[PDB]
Amino acid sequence: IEKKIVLRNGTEAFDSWEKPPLPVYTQFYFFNVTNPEEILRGETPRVEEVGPYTYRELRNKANIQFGDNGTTISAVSNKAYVFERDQSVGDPKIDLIRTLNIPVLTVIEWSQVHFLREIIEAMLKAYQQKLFVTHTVDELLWGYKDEILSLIHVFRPDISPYFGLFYEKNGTNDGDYVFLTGEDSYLNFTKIVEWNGKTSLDWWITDKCNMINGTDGDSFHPLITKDEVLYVFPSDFCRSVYITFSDYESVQGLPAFRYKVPAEILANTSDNAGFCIPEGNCLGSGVLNVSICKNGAPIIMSFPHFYQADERFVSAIEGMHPNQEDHETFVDINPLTGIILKAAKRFQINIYVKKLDDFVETGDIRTMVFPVMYLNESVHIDKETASRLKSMIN
Ligand SMILES: *[C@@H]1O[C@H](CO)[C@@H](O[C@@H]2O[C@H](CO)[C@@H](O[C@@H]3O[C@H](CO[C@H]4O[C@H](CO)[C@@H](O)[C@H](O)[C@@H]4O)[C@@H](O)[C@H](O[C@H]4O[C@H](CO)[C@@H](O)[C@H](O)[C@@H]4O)[C@@H]3O)[C@H](O)[C@H]2NC(C)=O)[C@H](O)[C@H]1NC(C)=O
Ligand SMILES: *[C@@H]1O[C@H](CO)[C@@H](O[C@@H]2O[C@H](CO)[C@@H](O[C@@H]3O[C@H](CO)[C@@H](O)[C@H](O[C@H]4O[C@H](CO)[C@@H](O)[C@H](O)[C@@H]4O)[C@@H]3O)[C@H](O)[C@H]2NC(C)=O)[C@H](O)[C@H]1NC(C)=O
Numbered sequence: 001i002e003k004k005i006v007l008r009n010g011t012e013a014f015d016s017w018e019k020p021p022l023p024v025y026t027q028f029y030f031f032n033v034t035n036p037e038e039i040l041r042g043e044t045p046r047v048e049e050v051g052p053y054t055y056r057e058l059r060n061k062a063n064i065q066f067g068d069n070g071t072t073i074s075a076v077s078n079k080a081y082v083f084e085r086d087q088s089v090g091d092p093k094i095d096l097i098r099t100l101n102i103p104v105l106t107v108i109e110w111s112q113v114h115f116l117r118e119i120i121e122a123m124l125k126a127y128q129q130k131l132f133v134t135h136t137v138d139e140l141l142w143g144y145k146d147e148i149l150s151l152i153h154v155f156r157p158d159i160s161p162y163f164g165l166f167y168e169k170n171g172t173n174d175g176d177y178v179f180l181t182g183e184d185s186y187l188n189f190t191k192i193v194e195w196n197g198k199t200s201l202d203w204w205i206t207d208k209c210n211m212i213n214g215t216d217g218d219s220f221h222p223l224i225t226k227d228e229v230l231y232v233f234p235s236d237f238c239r240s241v242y243i244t245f246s247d248y249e250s251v252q253g254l255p256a257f258r259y260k261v262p263a264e265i266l267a268n269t270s271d272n273a274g275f276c277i278p279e280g281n282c283l284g285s286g287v288l289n290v291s292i293c294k295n296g297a298p299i300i301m302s303f304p305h306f307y308q309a310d311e312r313f314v315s316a317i318e319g320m321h322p323n324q325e326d327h328e329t330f331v332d333i334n335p336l337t338g339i340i341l342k343a344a345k346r347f348q349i350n351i352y353v354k355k356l357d358d359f360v361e362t363g364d365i366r367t368m369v370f371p372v373m374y375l376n377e378s379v380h381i382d383k384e385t386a387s388r389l390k391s392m393i394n
């Protein structure tokens with residue numbers, strides 16, 4: 001019998017939940033575009049992998065308020081990134097990556113449908129823009145100021161002049177959570193009962209696809225069994241996800257279940273039909289159109305190098321060489337305590353791009369899902385926390 005693991009002040013679990021002792025690392029990998037003018041004339045894109053750029057994460061919960069007798073708890077997870085130079089391939093402020101111009105592809109999408117109405121497109125033809133641009137890794141991640149966005153900001157202050165993939169994500173949270181702690185049942189430990197004051201999502205077609213299942217992914221309920229499926233809600237992924245048992249593992253001195261993300265998640269099927277907007281029509285297996293959660297931006301999520309995806313996605317881009325061991329998402333969980341020992345959470349950011357006759361910027365470019373960057377969010381238990389854990393077992 002152990003629930004030493006519940007969120008209650010003074011307990012083992014709560015302190016660890018509030019200020020995680022295990023350091024998490026996020027490393028970024030970029031795809032440098034080697035043939036922009038040839039792509040614009042309709043040839044196959046050739047890219048180059050650049051990285052890692054390693055950032056150590058700072059984690060803790062704020063806004064903590066207990067609720068409902070000690071069954072529920074409200075919190076926000078703040079997260080910050082500290083760059084590690086010696087563990088990275090180079091200095092992200094010096095290093096240049098050439099890739100798609102995301103701000104202008106974004107406002108274009110905004111023009112055809114109207115998030116921004118059509119009419120200020122006349123900016124684009126006033127100031128002509130290149131589809132492929134060159135910025136530093138630091139500019140691409142943490143933001144830079146854009147010509148066209150700046151011009152719009154004048155008329156629409158609600159719209160930011162700045163764009164970055166992770167822009168204004170440093171030292172902030174993903175929004176308001178209320179977590180279900182474990183004292184009604186150990187099973188429902190650190191389970192998510194709401195996000196921004198709503199119990200389900202807006203975005204997806206089906207009821208079911210809009211469901212929020214599982215934990216935030218940083219931990220799991222104790223006494224996990226091999227047979228059972230484990231649910232996660234990665235907010236940034238804009239949908240719930242489950243992982244399934246793969247193998248038995250050992251991390252440090254501790255036994256572990258190896259849970260991985262199955263191919264069922266991104267496959268074009270059945271249950272996943274609700275993720276294809278607007279009608280049940282999917283780009284294919286292995287991709288997720290997140291435009292809805294990404295502010296109307298033509299962003300397509302996928303796994304690194306289109307791992308677990310239709311091959312035509314891989315074939316479309318020269319330089320995509322997917323493999324299981326490098327690009328898979330796995331989590332090694334201590335079965336008894338539901339604690340994560342080792343994990344690699346990996347996913348890719350891509351951009352949908354197609355030829356447009358109203359926009360000369362698009363040229364003759366092929367219709368494809370264009371890779372920009374992927375990442376590995378990892379954690380590894382040290383031996384002093386491990387051995388202390390393995391004596392605490394008894
Ligand atoms: C991803 O792919 C992109 C595009 O292919 C690469 O971006 C290029 O990066 C290289 C450097 O790695 C750049 O080449 C350098 O440009 C510098 C800037 O040139 C301007 O300024 C100088 C004055 O300082 C002017 O004379 C010049 O006309 C330009 O106006 C130069 O300063 C560099 O010169 C030095 O380079 C080598 C030594 O490094 C020597 O041979 C030279 O004599 C001199 O010492 C150099 O020419 C290039 O401009 C970038 N291209 C673009 C489009 O931005 C990324 O590097 C690549 N990413 C990775 C990780 O590889
Ligand atoms: C986070 O994710 C990234 C991306 O997956 C990951 O970086 C990768 O690490 C792996 C493991 O170290 C690297 O794979 C190696 O590649 C070199 C290239 O020559 C090989 O020599 C290595 O081969 C050894 O191990 C293999 C295991 O099967 C054997 O097949 C082989 O014969 C050797 O024994 C190994 O394959 C990979 O190159 C990097 N990728 C990048 C882009 O850096 C990172 O490790 C993950 N975790 C952490 C904590 O960073």
Ligand SMILES: *[C@@H]1O[C@H](CO)[C@@H](O[C@@H]2O[C@H](CO)[C@@H](O[C@@H]3O[C@H](CO[C@H]4O[C@H](CO)[C@@H](O)[C@H](O)[C@@H]4O)[C@@H](O)[C@H](O)[C@@H]3O)[C@H](O)[C@H]2NC(C)=O)[C@H](O)[C@H]1NC(C)=O
Binds near residue numbers: 352
């Ligand atoms: C990825 O997902 C995106 C969003 O989930 C997809 O974009 C959606 O699908 C198409 C884009 O081609 C749009 O459908 C058109 O919408 C426009 C705009 O409608 C609005 O404006 C009219 C008139 O101003 C107004 O009456 C309406 O109420 C709307 O407010 C119409 O002109 C078209 O006829 C057609 O309806 C969707 O609107 C668009 N949605 C969003 C939220 O952007 C995108 O296509 C997906 N990508 C892939 C590759 O599948």
Ligand SMILES: *[C@@H]1O[C@H](CO)[C@@H](O[C@@H]2O[C@H](CO)[C@@H](O[C@@H]3O[C@H](CO)[C@@H](O)[C@H](O)[C@@H]3O)[C@H](O)[C@H]2NC(C)=O)[C@H](O)[C@H]1NC(C)=O
Binds near residue numbers: 208
């Ligand atoms: C989050 O909610 C549930 C997690 O369990 C996911 O939906 C579940 O999907 C399975 C199969 O796809 C359903 O199995 C069904 O069993 C019931 C009877 O028990 C029956 O009505 C069906 O015919 C089928 O046999 C399961 O019931 C269903 N869960 C619920 C509550 O209906 C859902 O996909 C998850 N969403 C995400 C985004 O992960």
Ligand SMILES: *[C@@H]1O[C@H](CO)[C@@H](O[C@@H]2O[C@H](CO)[C@@H](O)[C@H](O)[C@H]2NC(C)=O)[C@H](O)[C@H]1NC(C)=O
Binds near residue numbers: 080083142170171
């Ligand atoms: C994200 O924010 C954190 C803090 O909120 C930054 O970490 C600090 O950076 C300053 C300036 O580089 C240093 O003086 C501090 O020592 C850092 N704090 C710690 C705990 O080391 C971090 O640099 C920011 N990262 C990015 C990419 O902006």
Ligand SMILES: *[C@@H]1O[C@H](CO)[C@@H](O[C@@H]2O[C@H](CO)[C@@H](O)[C@H](O)[C@H]2NC(C)=O)[C@H](O)[C@H]1NC(C)=O
Binds near residue numbers: 269270284
């Ligand atoms: C995703 O799956 C659906 C079916 O679940 C595909 O639609 C089918 O397309 C094939 C073409 O090979 C036809 O034979 C079927 O009759 C179609 N069925 C339906 C219900 O449309 C759809 O094309 C798939 N998406 C992609 C990108 O391959």
Ligand SMILES: *[C@@H]1O[C@H](CO)[C@@H](O)[C@H](O)[C@H]1NC(C)=O
Binds near residue numbers: 180184187
């Ligand atoms: C968690 O506790 C039990 C175990 O599954 C379940 O019946 C209950 O509905 C859950 N509580 C909430 C608030 O969802």
